[PDB]
Amino acid sequence: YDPNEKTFDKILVANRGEIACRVIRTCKKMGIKTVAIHSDVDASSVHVKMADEAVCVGPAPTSKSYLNMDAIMEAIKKTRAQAVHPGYGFLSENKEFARCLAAEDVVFIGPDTHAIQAMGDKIESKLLAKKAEVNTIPGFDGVVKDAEEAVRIAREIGYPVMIKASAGGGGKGMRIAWDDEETRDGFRLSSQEAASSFGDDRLLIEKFIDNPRHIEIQVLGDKHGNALWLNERECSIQRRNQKVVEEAPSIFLDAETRRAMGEQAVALARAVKYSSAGTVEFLVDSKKNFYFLEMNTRLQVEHPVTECITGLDLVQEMIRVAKGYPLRHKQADIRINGWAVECRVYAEDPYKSFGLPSIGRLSQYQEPLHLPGVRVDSGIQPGSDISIYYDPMISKLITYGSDRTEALKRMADALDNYVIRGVTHNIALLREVIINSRFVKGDISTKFLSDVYPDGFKGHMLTKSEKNQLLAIASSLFVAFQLRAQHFQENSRMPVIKPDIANWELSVKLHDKVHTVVASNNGSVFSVEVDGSKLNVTSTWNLASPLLSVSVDGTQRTVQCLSREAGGNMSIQFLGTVYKVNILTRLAAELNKFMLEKVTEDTSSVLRSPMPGVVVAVSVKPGDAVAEGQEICVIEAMKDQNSMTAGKTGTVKSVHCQAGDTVGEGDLLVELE
């Protein structure tokens, strides 16, 4: 971070989110002015406020704002910025952008056009890697055009077959084939999908590696001809062929294999004359045999992890190399220091296919920056919203330690101390992954999530002791709220006679079971008896802080109280998982035994208004039996006619809606069976 060295005085960051913030932070540490592009919706983002000046480039969609070459070039000309940093994604691997930037005097901080073009298609990448004497996945070199050629190639390469789309990206257009019929129908549908998605329609057939390990080598090159490999990374934990958890050194690897893979990656980089930061990805089998798989000619998303074990700043090195300076490190200087782990906190529901993108506005956002060995890379601030236009990633959380165990412990603590209110996230899944027995042992593959959760993610299956601890914490919190409710100021007209209750006898319903709890308070210490077991819970009992730290029998636990109702319902985030409990007094439970179970007649057999809108006309009458796919009535809503399908069978008892009528959400319109 020497300011004496002369670099560009103006850099434009042609990206958004956390990567823009990271680049701007590096530039500020390097004393470089920054220009930030943004859309209209991102006018109040973190990166625009962090930068020195901002330029609007278009509307919300990425096709018109961040992929709009003309707007970016107008911004560059207006701001007279000397350098441009594309981050990752968007225009980072676009040859037209690089060429048009090279037309002017503005420099592109990244690989040259030749390197990007070479590693732009997978077939040519594989051919070049084979020419460069790098182990490659066995398969057929060429574009498969008919299903017969595909099934033949499957015959001479073995029935396990990986069908892939050229260029591709985002973990899409890739499928598995075990049979000739599977080969041909997968080939046809993959051609159709590639036409729908990319249009390249060039498909590749290769051998599928069984139980593979995704190991990346981080390479760094300069225009003079020096190439370095900055250790490795492991990114096996994936869903939808996308990483969620990354590890700094691969526990699966030893020194010799690491050196071999680093040398091979350096050889490939020299072959393509790479002159920036990049990564070479490999699929290592159980027998420590690695094969080349793709080369990312851009900054890697999980790059900070290696920054924790090498002590380097990759963005600064990219800037210096783009300026023209030689590398200031040698291969001997690169060394492994400690251990590091990264988790991607996404705004998605982990209970639906290991993640389903969600939308909303963050009403509360607090990061565990004060915890030891914690680094956060986020472009999210309180009040930020998650839209349908951009990636739903919330943050990248990185922890480092002396060994793997310390890093994992700090990772778990950071996940426990992370406040996100407003959207659904995947913190529960990450915490379950990092404390898994197999993950701690180290035996993992790219199918870890698929086989650890064959039926889908279900949450933390809490043991007996953990269940008792959770029940004790919930009961103590309930009693603490009850006690706080009795603290009034002095009235001097009618004094308050505080009740002298000694033991609180409660019935606590968790899942489908009811437990009897006896709680006693002795100041800041609660003695809780759960079904015989005795526990002591102590804390400051601050009922307003989002994070509450308690000590149960000496074990420290951080919990969050997401929701609470006067009826006894509480949502408690404990060990990363949200549990719904219901707490009543014993008398309340005994009297509640007489309450009738409410039956919901609105659920089915009723056209309860799914959403507010105006109905043009009604296509049904009393006495008509609906069928699946038969719309009941066409209703214009969100400026769209929503003729919702029945999706069930039932004779219409009565009709309450008329043609061209405005009806809000929750209003009955058609009664059926």
Binding site: S44, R361, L362, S363, Q364, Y365, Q381, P382, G383, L543, A544
Partner: protein, 247 residues
């Protein structure tokens, strides 16, 4: 719950263009202690929100407009629902906090035949006779007599604040231009000048109608401070057996 807690989540909650709506319940939850709100009549006359909460441990009554429902316009049901709640809070020494995003009253023959004048007068009266401390925050539009009704400074209001998105005017720009520059028939620049000069809190700020224009992230803190100084508010009014509210 510290009384000086900042609420940065409110800095961008109001959309830039007035066509979009937002939820004032989010603002209420952010502002009040522990985000705990006891709503009264939550499923009836949903264009207005009334309820009980606490700030710095003191019970407060909250009244606000709901731009999600009917663009936040006032009508008969909302007027009565807010009026009786305000009367109860005033009768039992409970401070009142108002959030204003009202564009006006709901038009139509149904409202006029139902007696919208009487019920609007009910709400205006309820805010006017209140002698408890009153704190008002204008988040967006405040047009016409509705602005006077929703606890204006001129009804013996105590403290009035405007967010940088507030708009206090007689009505929207188009109507004012079409009624002022009737014969000009050159509204092309007239509307631009009118929106540049009056479509902002400045006309009310320069006259002293709002005490300050505050950042949305400081709202709670400001309110708490006011509630500390207004706790000893005594006022004197002419004697009567009782008044005659337009029931």
């Amino acid at each position: 719950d510290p009384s000086d807690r900042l609420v940065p989540e409110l800095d961008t909650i109001v959309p830039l263009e007035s066509t979009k709506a937002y939820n004032m319940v989010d603002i209420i939850h952010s502002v009040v202690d522990e985000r705990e709100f006891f709503e009264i009549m939550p499923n009836y006359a949903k264009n207005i929100i009334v309820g009980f909460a606490r700030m710095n441990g003191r019970t407060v009554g909250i009244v606000g407009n709901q731009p999600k429902v009917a663009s936040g316009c006032l009508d008969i049901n909302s007027s009565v629902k807010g009026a009786r709640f305000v009367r109860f809070c005033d009768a039992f020494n409970i401070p009142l906090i108002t959030f204003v995003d009202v564009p006006g009253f709901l038009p139509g023959t149904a409202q006029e035949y139902g007696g919208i004048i009487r019920h609007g007068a009910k709400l205006l009266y309820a805010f006017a006779e209140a002698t408890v401390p009153k704190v008002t925050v204008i988040t967006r539009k405040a047009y016409g007599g509705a602005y006077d009704v929703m606890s204006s400074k001129h009804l013996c209001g105590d403290t009035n604040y405007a967010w940088p998105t507030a708009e206090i005017a007689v009505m929207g720009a188009k109507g004012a231009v079409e009624i002022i520059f009737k014969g000009h028939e050159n509204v092309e620049a007239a509307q631009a000048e009118y929106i540049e000069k009056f479509a902002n809190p400045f006309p009310a700020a320069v006259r002293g109608f709002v005490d300050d224009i505050i950042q949305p992230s400081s709202t709670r803190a400001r309110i708490c401070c006011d509630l500390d100084v207004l706790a000893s508010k005594k006022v004197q009014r002419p004697w009567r057996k009782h008044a005659n509210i337009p029931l």
